[PDB]
Structure 1
Amino acid sequence: CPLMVKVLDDVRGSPAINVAVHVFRKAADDTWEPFASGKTSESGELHGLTTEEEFVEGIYKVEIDTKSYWKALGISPFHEHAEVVFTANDSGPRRYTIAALLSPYSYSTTAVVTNP
C-alpha cells in the first residue's frame, strides 16, 4: 500500500471517520485527472487507494473533504477542503503517508515517506 491518508479531529480528540478523500494526478494538458478516492475508516485511516503499478510518477493532489466533516458534526468550518500537492515516485517507488490534523479554522498536514 503505497499511499495512505490518516485524519484526526482536534475538537473531539478522535479519529475523523467517514471523511471523503479524492486523489488527482496532473495530466499532460495541466488539468487534474481523477486518480483514486475513498472514505476514512473508524480508525481515521484510508488504505487501499492505489497499487504500486497504478501509482506512477507524477504530481498528485490529495483533497480531503473537511467542510462536509464539520457540517456533519454541527460545527461551522472555514476551509472548503484540505489540499496536499506533491511530486511522487520521481526516483522510484516510495510509500507515502499523508496525515491531516483538523480544526474548524486550521489544519496541519505532514508527510511520512519511506523506501520499500
Structure 2
Amino acid sequence: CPLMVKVLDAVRGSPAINVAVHVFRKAADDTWEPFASGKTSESGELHGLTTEEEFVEGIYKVEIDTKSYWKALGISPFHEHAEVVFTANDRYTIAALLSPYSYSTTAVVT
C-alpha cells in the first residue's frame, strides 16, 4: 500500500469514521482527475486506495470531506473540506487531525 489516509477527531478523541476521502492526480492540462476514493473505517483509516503500479510520480490532491463529518455530529464547522496537495516523488501516510475550526495534517513517508 503506497498510499494510506488516517483521520482523527480532536474533539472526541477518536478515529473519524465514515469520512469521505477523494484522491485526485494533476493531469497534463492543469486540471484534477479522479484517482481514488473511499470512506474511512472504524479505525479512521483508508487503505487500498491504489497500487504501486498506478501510483506514479505526480502531483496529488487528497480531499477529506470534513464538513459532512461535523454536520453529522450536529456541529457547524468552518472548512468546506480539508485538502492536502503534494508531489509523490519515488509508503505515504497522510494523517489529519480535525476540529470544527481547525485541522492539522502531516505526511509520514517510510
Identify the match of residue 107 of structure 1 among 88, 103, 109.
103
Q: Give secondary structure in 1 for the equivalent of 2:72.
A: helix
Tell me how far 1:89 sits from its aligned partner: 2.6
| Distance of 1:89 and 1:41 partners within structure 2 | 27
1:10-89 aligned at under 5 Å gives the runs: 10-89=10-89
Tell me how far 1:61 sits from its aligned partner: 0.3
Tell me how far 1:74 sits from its aligned partner: 0.7
| Distance of 1:47 and 1:70 partners within structure 2 | 22
Identity of aligned residues (%): 99
TM-score, normalised to structure 2, is 0.98
TM-score, normalised to structure 1, is 0.93
Q: How many residue pairs were aligned? A: 110
Could you list the per-position Cα deviations for residues 18-59 of structure 1 after superposition, in whole angstroms to 9, with x for gaps in the alignment?
000000000000000000000000000000000001111100
Structure 1 ranges of 4+ moved more than 6 A: none
| Distance of 1:74 and 1:89 partners within structure 2 | 40
Tell me how far 1:80 sits from its aligned partner: 0.6
| Distance of 1:53 and 1:89 partners within structure 2 | 14
Any unmatched runs of 5+ in structure 1? none
Any unmatched runs of 5+ in structure 2? none
Question: How much is the aligned-residue C-alpha RMSD, in angstroms?
Answer: 0.6
| Distance of 2:51 and 2:39 partners within structure 1 | 17
Q: Give secondary structure in 1 for the equivalent of 2:23.
A: strand
